[PDB]
Amino acid sequence: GPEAADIRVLRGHQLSITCLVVTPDDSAIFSAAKDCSIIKWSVESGRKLHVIPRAGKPPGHSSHVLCMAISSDGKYLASGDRSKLILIWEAQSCQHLYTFTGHRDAVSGLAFRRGTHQLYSTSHDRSVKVWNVAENSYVETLFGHQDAVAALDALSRECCVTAGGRDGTVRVWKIPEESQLVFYGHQGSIDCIHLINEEHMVSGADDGSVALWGLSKKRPLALQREAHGLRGEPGLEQPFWISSVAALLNTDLVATGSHSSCVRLWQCGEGFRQLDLLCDIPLVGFINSLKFSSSGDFLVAGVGQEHRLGRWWRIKEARNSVCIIPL
Numbered sequence: 001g002p003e004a005a006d007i008r009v010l011r012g013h014q015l016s017i018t019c020l021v022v023t024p025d026d027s028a029i030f031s032a033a034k035d036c037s038i039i040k041w042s043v044e045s046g047r048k049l050h051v052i053p054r055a056g057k058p059p060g061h062s063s064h065v066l067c068m069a070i071s072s073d074g075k076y077l078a079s080g081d082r083s084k085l086i087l088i089w090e091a092q093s094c095q096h097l098y099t100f101t102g103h104r105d106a107v108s109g110l111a112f113r114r115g116t117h118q119l120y121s122t123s124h125d126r127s128v129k130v131w132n133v134a135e136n137s138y139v140e141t142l143f144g145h146q147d148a149v150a151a152l153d154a155l156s157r158e159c160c161v162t163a164g165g166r167d168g169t170v171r172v173w174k175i176p177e178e179s180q181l182v183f184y185g186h187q188g189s190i191d192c193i194h195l196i197n198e199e200h201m202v203s204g205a206d207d208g209s210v211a212l213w214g215l216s217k218k219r220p221l222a223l224q225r226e227a228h229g230l231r232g233e234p235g236l237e238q239p240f241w242i243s244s245v246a247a248l249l250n251t252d253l254v255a256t257g258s259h260s261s262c263v264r265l266w267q268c269g270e271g272f273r274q275l276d277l278l279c280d281i282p283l284v285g286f287i288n289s290l291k292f293s294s295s296g297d298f299l300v301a302g303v304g305q306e307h308r309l310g311r312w313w314r315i316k317e318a319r320n321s322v323c324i325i326p327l
Helices: none
Strands: 008-011 017-022 028-033 038-042 048-052 065-070 076-081 086-090 095-100 107-112 118-123 127-132 137-143 151-154 159-163 169-174 179-184 190-197 200-205 210-214 222-224 244-247 253-257 262-268 275-282 286-292 298-304 321-326
Touching (some): 017 298, 017 321, 028 065, 028 298, 028 321, 076 107, 118 151, 159 190, 169 190, 200 244, 210 253, 262 298
Parallel strands (some): 017 286, 065 107, 107 151, 190 244, 244 286
Antiparallel strands (some): 008 321, 017 028, 028 038, 065 076, 076 086, 086 095, 107 118, 118 127, 151 159, 159 169, 169 179, 200 210, 210 222, 244 253, 253 262, 262 275, 298 321
């Protein structure tokens, strides 16, 4: 059980963190925030390795970055923003390489196909797009979601998964098969998603539910209601909404984040048919992003005083920080 005395709180962002990635070699973290900057941090020292400031016209973002992805070889960083752009960077040097245009609204989810330089994106424009980063090329656009798309993840197969926000679907995009599997589940807005292995994923919803899914089955394999508890009055309590989820690849460990003052670790039961609470990790604020290290030695939380998508709520006791949680 990691406590405050264990969690390194990295300060630098001027506003709420919206997303982050950990480099495959676990040496560095890239974070982005509502300040429109991207910061590269050293995991070992906690110091900044590079800062890409808000945007001669030097490269950078002029509006919020909402999502980021890093390729499995650690070569490319992709960052998607409210300007409808995906910026591509050399992750080693933070040198700008390319800008993908084509989305018609904010870019909301990004993931590289593991073992390749193929990039999948999704957007408030309701589309999923496929790009080849090695060749700075656009490949194709896929449709299905009925509303703005909330999130996207991918692993090694020519496939990606999306959280549909308000359309209440999780969709599985089988690209060469030219097929889309549609799943319906844990109610309200499906706001975050992460693959656990090639055949299973975890999602979080604005009604506080955390669901486990398998690719075969159209309904969740498991569903934990009110996963971060409640606030309010008898008969009218409102559940804490799930703002981030993460899974440690090829294991049974998942993490969830809300604004309930703790990050929760869960263990998936046999066949992913149950979610069991392992521990509460104390951490105040909106848990806007969660990512496990490759080693599983640590978990990284991106924390904001505000929710990653808006200004509706403020937690003044929180700090806009990248938090390294040793496991």
